[PDB]
Amino acid sequence: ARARRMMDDMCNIALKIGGYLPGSEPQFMTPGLALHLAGTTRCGLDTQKTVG
Amino acid sequence: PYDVFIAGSGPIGATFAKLCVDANLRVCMVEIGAADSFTSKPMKGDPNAPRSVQFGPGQVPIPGYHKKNEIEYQKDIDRFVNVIKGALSTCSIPTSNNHIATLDPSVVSNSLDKPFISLGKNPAQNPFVNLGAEAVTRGVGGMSTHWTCATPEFFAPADFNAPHRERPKLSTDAAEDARIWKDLYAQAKEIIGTSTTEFDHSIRHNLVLRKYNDIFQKENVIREFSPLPLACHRLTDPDYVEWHATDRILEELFTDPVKRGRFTLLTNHRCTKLVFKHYRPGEENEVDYALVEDLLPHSVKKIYARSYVVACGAVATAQVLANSHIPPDERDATIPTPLMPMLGKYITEQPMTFCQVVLDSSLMEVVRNPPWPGLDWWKEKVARHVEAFPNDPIPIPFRDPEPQVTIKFTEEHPWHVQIHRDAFSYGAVAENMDTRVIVDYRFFGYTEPQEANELVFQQHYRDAYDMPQPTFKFTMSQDDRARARRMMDDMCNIALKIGGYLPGSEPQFMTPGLALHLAGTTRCGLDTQKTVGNTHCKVHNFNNLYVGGNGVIETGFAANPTLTSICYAIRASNDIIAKFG
Amino acid sequence: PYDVFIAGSGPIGATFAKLCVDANLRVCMVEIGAADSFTSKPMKVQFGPGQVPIPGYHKKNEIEYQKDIDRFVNVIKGALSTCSIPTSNNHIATLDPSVVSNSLDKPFISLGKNPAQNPFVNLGAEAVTRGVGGMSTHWTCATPEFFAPADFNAPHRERPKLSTDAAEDARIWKDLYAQAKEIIGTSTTEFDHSIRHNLVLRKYNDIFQKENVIREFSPLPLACHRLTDPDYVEWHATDRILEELFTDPVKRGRFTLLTNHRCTKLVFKHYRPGEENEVDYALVEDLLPHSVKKIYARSYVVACGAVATAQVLANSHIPPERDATIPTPLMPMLGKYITEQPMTFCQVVLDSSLMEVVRNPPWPGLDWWKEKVARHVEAFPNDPIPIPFRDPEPQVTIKFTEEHPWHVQIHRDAFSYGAVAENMDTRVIVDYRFFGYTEPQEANELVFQQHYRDAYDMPQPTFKFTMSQDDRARARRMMDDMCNIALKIGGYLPGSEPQFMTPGLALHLAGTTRCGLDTQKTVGNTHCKVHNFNNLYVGGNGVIETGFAANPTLTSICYAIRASNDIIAKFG
Amino acid sequence: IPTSNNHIATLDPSVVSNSLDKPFISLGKNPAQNPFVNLGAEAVTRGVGGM
Ligand SMILES: *Cc1cc2c(cc1C)Nc1c([nH]c(=O)[nH]c1=O)N2C[C@H](O)[C@H](O)[C@H](O)COP(=O)(O)OP(=O)(O)OC[C@H]1O[C@@H](n2cnc3c(N)ncnc32)[C@H](O)[C@@H]1O
Ligand SMILES: *Cc1cc2c(cc1C)Nc1c([nH]c(=O)[nH]c1=O)N2C[C@H](O)[C@H](O)[C@H](O)COP(=O)(O)OP(=O)(O)OC[C@H]1O[C@@H](n2cnc3c(N)ncnc32)[C@H](O)[C@@H]1O
Ligand SMILES: [Mg+2]
């Protein structure tokens, strides 16, 4: 639900100062492209749900 | 002489023919293209008619039938895109001299100062002010053999002196203007067969229409969604629709032997030009004859009539009339048209944005359990499908018709919205998706009429039919641009309420001219100094010369023009009947 | 009862109709598609009173397509319905995360796909056209004969045997091919005043006369005629075959053509394999809205093309687990030994040195050429290409031989040029299409699904096709031959470098209802009568039992003649 | 990178090919990966200073 709203937000924002360049129209990217994977050795206060 | 000569056999030329032959006039129609799409109807009075099968004895073929009516295309709808592409001839293709660096070094090549000279290109066209996708269809029925059949009315504001209107003025009195339009639209809708109810039992249509109205009732600005008026009727087998075309306009001129004897249709015959009484600008004049050439070998003919109608579409009507400025017997020079000085000036065409979406997964639950009353037909169809295909993730039945939804133009959101499906050619990523959950969006804007926007015709370059090469000089205004941006924004906002963009069909502008709604090339109206013809589409200074088609329309409009152009063809035909009957 | 019932209105069905009506037989022909392409001719101005409309006219005859030939590719694509498209379940990684999607365990169930087709043994580009005239409303009209070797016991031949006697076989084929050529209007002269055609043909002959292995180039035989206005060609189609059945009211009175009518199946006297049988009636359905008819005739002909002929006959095995096919024990060789042609393709741009040939041809006496070049050069002095603007394409072939056993066409087909390629002028492009053959093998088959159906509710076709080792060896040689030949006169156009095409693209599928002398390995005899049925005949490329490389229509017309004559003898 | 067994319909018929029964076994693919629950663009950089 947030992903859809994000996409809607981007279209609204971008169009305030320009128009989409052909080939680079609004689109989702392949999952993982951000390279911001996290939580694989997750650390925090809840000992039973964390690695550290 | 014939009573009426008509160049062009699209739905406008056919309306003139129908009305004039129904008023007992004798009509000669010429069409540059072939008869290439047919249905079959019983000939009236033939004793074999009751028994008859299509195209068998007792029946007559009727040209100008919609090509999408063939069952193959009702079953495999995305194949129709190829038919449309096959039917469109691009008006103006500019030259280029690009280097191909990986040619084998022994082969013929272009160079910097020997470019190719290639058949089919227009050396005078500046690519930057072109309508590069503006195209024509030559054939009996014109573009009506493939059109999508949308027939909206044009918007008329509550204030008659509002700064913009889509519907042109036919009178300077607001009440009479309204009267006239209500009569013409009623008759145009009857001629073409407009309906807003032929998708009333589609799940997809009702899903989209009702959901959008529910969503937009809850927003700060209210927007109304309605069925798109379409010239079609769904058949007694509801899996099939008959899309309407020129065939229904011409029908009785073929089936009725009395009407047939007053109608002549010459196919593969080009109207090259009209020949006038004299060539002096500003003075009363008359057409003396039409110069027509038979393009098939078996040929130049003078056709005499009392009145002449040029209904060759927006490019070609102007083309014929430009060519007519060269009486019979600088490389980039164009043909001056001092007899019709506003010809090809104030041209308009619609900017267009497009996208497709995949419907939200959440809407599939609405399909399984819809909240609106009066939908037992929907529930039953769904239950049948779910029990026949219990592993199908999509609960929409397999042959459910597509949606056919519009938002009518308003001054507050001054563009025309279609939410539907057209045939489309899926790429390698997008053809992995099921057709049932795709919805297309096409938003059309308007452009202001400006004298400097023009269609002109080359003296020294010719098209494939030996007619003067068209050249476009088209640039949108700052206000046109601003609306076009708002339009794109609106399309993104609306599309994303019910689905997410399909890869390869994300929000984009299309090539200028792709709408094919070019107008104002022979513009008709009350302002005599800025128009080619009057509100009856009679050309100024010519007592017996009429024009038809989208070219007569003098406003900047965003909605599909065909219905309004039929109104003008009515109005012009009635003038011809009164003067020449 | 009619005398003859015919399912299908392609050029084969039309040949049976014409010959049977000419012999005073009453014919009912049914065609699943629409009449959608017409000309008009006078009864014994086009589309007025006095003229009669004739369906099955070639779509390319419309002037629009003679003036803009590359547009005609859209017409062909619009006409072809792919036979068997396998299912797939590809992940689309960039869908918006809220939209309907396939998953590993819940794939889409999509109209128009064949879950039973293994893609690795498919003919993925095999397709059909449904309409009056079948594929003849868009075909390229090439009508060569098939190769018959000097030795009647050669291990391969293209032309099937119609007798076990060599001389008699030769006599029969000589008569059939002459009559076939007249029916369809074959000519080899319609490009003889093209500069491009003559440059290609004469250059290649000059080149290959100087090589130690001689190869002969000749004009491609085409069912067409150039009109009196030589910018135009009338491409022939089923209209020419049916013409008299429409224009002569006596003949019109013996011929009924029902369009949008599916031959769903034939119903037989009984369903016991191996015993003499007959067709009782055809089950036909009117698909147009305004129901099911039994149509009775003395004889029945299924001429529905290679796939759909076998499809009707398979469906007829049903009197009126998921992947199970329809068993066909009444016709046990139905769909077995199927053949299709591997094809290689490229395009070249002509060598720059050939333009000086165009300017000053070295062959004497070509006044027509020099005059056209002179007019061009005077009107367009800065054109670097001296070939005239509306100069017709080349239409050149090398006839199949056993030493180079493929069929070569050197010509221009309608083509959609990419972003690199359409910067090149069309006058200097030449296309190469090389077609090979595949040996008939029992395991290569077309079968029909019990529980899957096509868009017209017929049993879904499924292909199982794998080429042999010798077929592959020949195909590599064919590719090498194409590279060698093409590079003599030009260089590969970027984007159209030498490549194999998708199997089935040739649309020369054969052997699905194979006819011949070996009763045990055939569906029908050399008169195309189905074994054990006294009144059932088949027509089309599916009857051809050999592995052939050349274009099959002319040869199928020969078989339609021969079958028609058997029908006329027996049921006249 | 998940495995796949796509048919290449235009390969020269004499060449090495995959089949329905005998897919390629190709270095660098993960036979365990379901493509529909993948992070197909997740990637690493090996070098001093990492990414
Ligand atoms: C191609 C197309 C068109 C439309 C839609 C979609 C597509 C892909 N969708 C559509 C449109 N219009 C609407 O209002 N609603 C929609 O959903 N389409 C446009 C519509 O199709 C046109 O507005 C309409 O046909 C215009 O009718 P017309 O004014 O009669 O003009 P046509 O172009 O149809 O026919 C002209 C006719 O004249 C012939 N001609 C041209 N030159 C000559 C000469 N010199 N001599 C004789 N005849 C000539 C043409 O060949 C043509 O047949
Ligand atoms: C599409 C195509 C075809 C060929 C060439 C190029 C292209 C792009 N070029 C060509 C070919 N052949 C040659 O010899 N030389 C060339 O240059 N083409 C193939 C050629 O077009 C065919 O070989 C020829 O038509 C075969 O004729 P036919 O045996 O009469 O078969 P058709 O497929 O033409 O017509 C069959 C007909 O039957 C109807 N049908 C199918 N099922 C039914 C059922 N159940 N009921 C009733 N009718 C049925 C089809 O609709 C079709 O009309
Ligand atoms: Mg009505």
From Swiss-Prot, chain A:
Q: PTM per UniProt?
A: Not glycosylated.
Induction of its expression = Induced by carbon starvation.
Family classification: Belongs to the GMC oxidoreductase family.
State the function annotated in the UniProt record: Catalyzes the oxidation of various aldopyranoses and disaccharides on carbon-2 to the corresponding 2-keto sugars concomitant with the reduction of O(2) to H(2)O(2). Plays an important role in lignin degradation of wood rot fungi by supplying the essential cosubstrate H(2)O(2) for the ligninolytic peroxidases, lignin peroxidase and manganese-dependent peroxidase. The preferred substrate is D-glucose which is converted to 2-dehydro-D-glucose, an intermediate of a secondary metabolic pathway leading to the antibiotic cortalcerone.
How is this protein organized at the quaternary level? Answer: Homotetramer.
Where's it found, cell-wise?
Periplasm
Q: What is this protein called?
A: Pyranose 2-oxidase
Lineage at the top is: Eukaryota, Fungi, Dikarya, Basidiomycota, Agaricomycotina
Name the active site residues.
H36 (proton acceptor)
Which residue pairs form cystines in this protein?
none
